[PDB]
Amino acid sequence: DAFVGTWKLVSSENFDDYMKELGVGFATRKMGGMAKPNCIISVNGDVITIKTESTLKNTEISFILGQEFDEVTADDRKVKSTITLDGGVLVQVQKWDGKSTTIKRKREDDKLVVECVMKGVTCTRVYERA
Numbered sequence: 028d029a030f031v032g033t034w035k036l037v038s039s040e041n042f043d044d045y046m047k048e049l050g051v052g053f054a055t056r057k058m059g060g061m062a063k064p065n066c067i068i069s070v071n072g073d074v075i076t077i078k079t080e081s082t083l084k085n086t087e088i089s090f091i092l093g094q095e096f097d098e099v100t101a102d103d104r105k106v107k108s109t110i111t112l113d114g115g116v117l118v119q120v121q122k123w124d125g126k127s128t129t130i131k132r133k134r135e136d137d138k139l140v141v142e143c144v145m146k147g148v149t150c151t152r153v154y155e156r157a
């Protein structure tokens with residue numbers, strides 16, 4: 028839809044602080060911090076797929092809006108995720124060990140903007156079309 032495409036990370040703010048708040052250790056934060064992944068979003072019927080590709084780590088999720096699914100995250104959390112579409116924003120919540128984090132993906136001019144919140148930390152990542 029508005030989201031379908033191949034997207035390249037161009038800017039990131041507060042990602043280390045976000046990863047620290049999730050409990051990610053030094054080595055994994057170090058491998059994630061300077062990475063510039065591609066995000067590839069596609070849709071087939073009811074099923075949306077989001078691939079994240081980077082030199083040292085790839086991940087993929089496929090889901091139906093409003094249907095909880097199990098996910099292994101790039102930092103190896105085993106989470107339960109639910110993704111909904113609210114006002115044109117794709118809103119993902121991940122739940123694990125009594126904690127939650129929310130990841131919101133929105134389209135703003137030429138940008139795919141991703142806002143990641145864990146407790147008091149808010150990280151913003153900006154992608155542009157490859």
Ligand SMILES: CC(C)(CC(=O)O)CC(=O)Nc1cc(Cl)cc(Cl)c1
Pocket residue numbers: 058059060062063064066079080081084085086101130141143152
């Ligand atoms: C939602 C998220 C936290 C942020 C975003 O979508 O931008 C997911 C993300 O970036 N995962 C990720 C990061 C690296 Cl560095 C490499 C690989 Cl494979 C995956």
